[PDB]
Amino acid sequence: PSETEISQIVEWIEQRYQQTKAHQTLAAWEYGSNLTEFNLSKKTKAAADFAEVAKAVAEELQQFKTDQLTNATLKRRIKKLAKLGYAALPADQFKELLGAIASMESNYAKAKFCAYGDATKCDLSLDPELTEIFANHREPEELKYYWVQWYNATGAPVRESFQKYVELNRQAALRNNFSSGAAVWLNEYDDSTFEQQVDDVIEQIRPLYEQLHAYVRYKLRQKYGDKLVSPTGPIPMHLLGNLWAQTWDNIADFTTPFPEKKLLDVTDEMIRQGYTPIKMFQMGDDFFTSLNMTKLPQTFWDKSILEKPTDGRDLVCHASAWDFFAIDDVRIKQCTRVNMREFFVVHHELGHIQYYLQYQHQPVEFRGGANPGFHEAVGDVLSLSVSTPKHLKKVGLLKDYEEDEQVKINQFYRAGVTKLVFLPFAYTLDKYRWGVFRGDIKPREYNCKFWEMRSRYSGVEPPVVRTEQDFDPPAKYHVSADVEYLRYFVSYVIQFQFHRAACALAGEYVKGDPEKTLNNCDIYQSTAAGNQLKEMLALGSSKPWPDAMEVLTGERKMSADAILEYFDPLYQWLLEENKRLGAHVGWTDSQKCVS
Template identity: 35%
Template sequence: MGTSKVSFVIVQLFAFFTWHAIAQEYVRMASNTNAAEAMQFLREYDREASGMCYRVTMSQWRFVTNITEYNRRRMLEELALNSKFERLSWRKAAAYDATRVSDVQSRRQLVKIVQGSRAALPEDKFNEIQQIITEMKEIYNAAKICPYGQKPYDSHLQRDSPFYPQSRQEPYDQTRSHTQDIYQPFGPGFPHETPENSNYCDMQLDPEISRILAHSRIESELVYVWKSFREQTGPKMKNRFMRYVQLANQAAVSTGYSDAGDQMRASYEDPSFRASLEEIYNQVAPLYKQLFTYVRRKLIQRYGERVVRPDGPIPAHLLGNMWAQNWKSIMDLVMPFPQAPNIDVTSEMLRQGFTPLRMFQMAEEFYTSMGMKPAPPEFWRGSMLARPAERSVQCTASAWDFCNRIDYRIKQCTEVTMQDLVSTHHEMAHIQYYLQYAEQPQLFRDGANPAFHEAVANAVTLSVYNIQHLQRVGLYNNRTHDPYQVSMNFLMTMALEKVAYLPFAFMVDQWRWSVFEDGVQNMNSRWWQMKLRFQGVIPPMQRTEADFDPGSKYHVISDQEYIKYFLGTVLEFQLYEQLCQAAGQAGHLHECDVYRSRDAGRLLSEIMQPGASKTASEIIRTMTRGRTNRISPESLVRYFRPLELWLRVQNRDEPLIGWSSNYQDIGLFAPQRGHGIKATYSMVLLVLSMMQFLFL
């Protein structure tokens, strides 16, 4: 073991024992056994937290719907007050011995206040970690590159506004709709134009870079934008991220967890959480491999074997997305039946004179047809449903709960397109969730676990985005093409968005947890090792530890957990199937529509009303009528079974379903620690670890 490694171990051991002692001190602090006082504290907390939440939410709403320096300063002032309130509340809650509180719901509230906070840190370090996260977000938001083939001094691109914001949302089915997530891209350094970049290189991730990755089929251009964006993000954040890891771990240990990953996982209330995740992933991996193999062959037809090896991984820049997490943009290359249409009713919506308001009224009627609640008058008065002409706004679609049981809003720069119609139903599902659990205490006004809100909203969109529903509402009436071919094209579109996303959504936090557990050595090589193992993708060029490619993903540097997207994608299909069964639907799962089903509406209300007052396992047991209390991928696999059968036929002559790795693949990112036997041994271990995945 080298000297540097020994030093690191000593430092880690010292930190562990130091913070273990602090954690024991906090356990001793929980010495107040007066249950009546604890109950009174919770009543006061509910009132004060609701008021604070309203003030912060309103300040952030004013900023993102009217981006000015004044509104930004007001928002930051409220956020600073909220941080102080969080620290004070944590200390009060930590002083009570929750085991002495007989009421289960009250105990649950006390635990929720304590377990997810970093307020156990001393004030200077608490402020430091907040500042580090803010600085990393500033760097990310300010990242700009030059146009392909254009020198910096030739650039003439300009932004419409110096405050033009970037969209940070996942694809519409993974939008961050909780208000605490939506605010995160905005901090003290919300991107302003600066002298060194305002007149020259001005291409940002959204929309310019994302558009190139989605639509360009010039391999050298794709390599250029892929590489350039990473040069403007990761290397500038690496040192800050390393300090963030140290502080996050200290906060977690102070709160009684082994590390920050352990603290993140606590909200899922599952002692075997990591094993459950592995089990779920192994069940969906065969479907992913079939899709991967088919897509690889189509990419070879477009780019050649010089770029994509017939039995190897896929270079990450070819899949239509900055992180290879969503492949729907390459549908033109992989469409099963090019002569049959892909489902897009945008032209019919325009022909019928749809407006943004009509789209939201249609979405509201979807829920009221199931016997659920209409949107309150405050929603229609306060929401921003279309882009205003007179001011700069942030357009990421999001649903907002103002924490006062009255005011709920949506912010969306709606255009008359099918994608925005689906997104509208998605965001209205969040509003319906808020309405259903409105009577819960503030701490319980959320999903049963972090995956639930998105899962519920996406389950509804599975019913909206299918041929049967679009026919029922008079938007699709194409009888001229083979229904089977249309169905396969539709399922391929969904698979490129949902199935292709699963391994990425799985590996992001696997990597993050490994950093919290094992330290910050070789962070970049571990990132690519996991991407190769789970996604089957490799970088298009050599990567080193100086690159820090995880820093190109916003959720990583903004301190937002990601495993909820993996579980949410699986859970949405499980919930969707239960709604379909309640509605009495038969036939292929992807053809089910629960529109106008009161029985499906009752089940959905039962799932939503408890909010976070019950555990996820309790909600799932209710959802499945007692058959299971676990998230299961069986419904997802069933939904895509017709496509999987088709893929198996297409792949029957392939020598390998999945991918194999060789020394060249791993050499693109493996750490170079020297030459000779030691380096060779490290490479062999990496190759063996990659080969293990082939036999899962």
């Protein structure tokens, strides 16, 4: 048969695949929104159904040579439709794997806690009570109690489900001709040197990260005292405003260089201006429309969940953005709260939605990111513009003020503790999981190799001694839910490449120009930038990701150049200020995990 004829076969296969994948997504949404055992059975049934379909599709497609085919687009449609992943397993083992994952995720989403000092109040959750305690409370013993409560409840109790998940994740990789689950994840980036590229970015980031780490540690020790914060050891992580210490934005003002100069937390103005969750999504919609990009369809507003329900049902509150593989059926589920942190999450998620809308005209197997990092980068690029004093003044969230060099340091500092510190964190999560998947990290050393890696690359440690009887990795959503995390590392690098290109197109960035830096660029209302961005996103997965990147940046590789430029003024200030203050840089290894 001619390629124009094979193209008719896959076209019929594509519609078959799309319909069962939609049915499966729909059942997953219902569980995600309403965690009942009944809804779990329907989720795995619909997943089992799709697994059958994908097996049949994969066999049906082995009847075409693909080495005498010429349309490259066509070869690519057949390869992506034939990629089974977990569906490669016999159905019994498939449902056993999904049940192991759901067992972890369910335990995470359903955890509840008694208040510090009040055993009669035991309805506290991660979202919102614990998140906000860590964000705003500066009492170490209270923070330590909740840290211990959280990890004891979401980590060790699911060790066995985790072990089962690892074993069958491996079986699925072998049945797909990969050496391990780690090769499967890395395959999504389509570059055999990609693991090395990530190590190279970590090494370029490290000197800057270590200067910032050193300043934060110095300030936390001045605030909390030397018995709590060692001047030379890793930072007790429960003091960094976040249960995983993945971003330290919540202690930015508490530790800022110039606390009596203008600060850039707009939470109080959001509250004071009567902001609501819906208003917050409306403003993110407006930013995308200002870029000549797709306005949110009405289906989004009808079916999205944008506040935590008040009816006591269990659900996954971890914010997510869903593509139902139809037309304009796109939804966010977010337990939104009215503060600046959540305002950026809004944009992150709406970037996922916008990507969905831009490539929904493609065949189903191209309806994804160019690689998983492109998907995570989209909304964060907007958040880079939204975070500038320029934009916050436009939208009225930041009152006017005299700008000087110290206000600019407070600004650079906030950005560093919000975004720069996350890269070592994101790196360690998949370096750890790759090690479990590959066998380099064995079950009897699961916990101390985790905390050892967190100490090596992030210089943070638990507030109490942990042991191998603890098992702490699943205390992080993406571990319990089996969501690859390198996507966020890649995003945090390339999003600055995307931001630089979009600012250039908006006439907001000139290299070397003090009035047009990456740090003060706002691409709000730049249809010139939106148009080039639209083009990249409309590709979905139809081209190799270097070609998608070139569309917006003229470059074809991930590079830390952009992000090192963004943070160079902060880096120069820290180098001098740590020397002046006598702050130690670097850290001894943590002693907080015992084997």
